[PDB]
Design a protein around this ligand. Structure first.
Ligand code: VS9
Ligand code: ZN
Length: 258
């Protein structure tokens, strides 16, 4: 009886195995755009993905992820609200059963069809396992997906999902350029939070881009054909793999932009 997103093992149950689920800096949150304060001291985000080396694509029974070589400073996030340099480990998505839900963060209570997370860890801690034990260990870059025009840079991902349908499956996924997933603007909101799946560790500086990317209905339909289950188990579509907004508590969301 592992955790998941269903009625009997979903987000409302997670606190039993992971008591930090009711902690002081949990994610995601609703971003109330009128209460977020513009911080003129926030630097532009520095996204250096030119030398990114993607390795594999994997269905982990809760999302799919594209993994990168994080053994050197090849694809790094710095600047913005961050001190130091953060290496790209992986990206993954959260999405809905229908277009009106799927994102984890919300914007004035609006839910997007999906949300892309690019997960990075602070090189001062040496490895990601160490970094998850630190309050400034990880930086996750969050990008909203709306449904409209296709995102050409996403298509290579969508086209291999047939090959990793069920939990456990992975495939080679080299030479993928994550720059093709980014919107024009790097205007962002930032706040201190957590991982949004178990272990829910409070180790994340969240950087959520204001500008969504558009993806097509056909692209998001391919996400929804994935399965939570392993091959040979009853088929349960991998949909609604998002944690709802959590209490903001004693936190301020800062905007990089007016
Ligand atoms: C593998 C691991 C132990 C060492 C490294 C750990 C990763 C770090 C990246 C990551 C991103 C997640 O999704 S999100 N949504 O919070 O970005 C959710 C969870 C984890 C944990 C799971 C546990
Ligand atoms: Zn995520």
């Amino acid at each position: 009886h592992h955790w998941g997103y269903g009625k009997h093992n979903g987000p409302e149950h997670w606190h039993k195995d992971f008591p930090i689920a009711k902690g002081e800096r949990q994610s995601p949150v609703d971003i109330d755009t009128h209460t977020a304060k513009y911080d003129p001291s926030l630097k532009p985000l520095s996204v250096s993905y030119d030398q990114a080396t993607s390795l594999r694509i994997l269905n982990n029974g809760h999302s799919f992820q594209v993994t990168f070589d994080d053994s050197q400073d090849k694809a790094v996030l710095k600047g913005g609200p961050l001190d130091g340099t953060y290496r790209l480990l992986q990206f993954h998505f959260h999405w809905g059963s229908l277009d009106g839900q799927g994102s984890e963060h919300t914007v004035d209570k609006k839910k997007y069809a999906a949300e892309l997370h690019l997960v990075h860890w602070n090189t001062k801690y040496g490895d990601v396992g160490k970094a998850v034990q630190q309050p400034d260990g990880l930086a996750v870059l969050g990008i909203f997906l709306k449904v409209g025009s296709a995102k050409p840079g996403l298509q290579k991902v969508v086209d291999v999902l047939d090959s990793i349908k069920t939990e456990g499956k992975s495939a080679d996924f080299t030479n993928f350029d994550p720059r093709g997933l980014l919107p024009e603007s790097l205007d962002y909101w930032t706040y201190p939070g957590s991982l949004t799946t178990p272990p829910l560790a409070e180790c994340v500086t969240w950087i959520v881009l204001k500008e969504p990317i558009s993806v097509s209905s056909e692209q998001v339909l391919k996400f929804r054909k994935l399965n939570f289950n392993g091959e040979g188990e009853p088929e349960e579509l991998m949909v609604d793999n998002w944690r709802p907004a959590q209490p903001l508590k004693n936190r301020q969301i800062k905007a990089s932009f007016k």
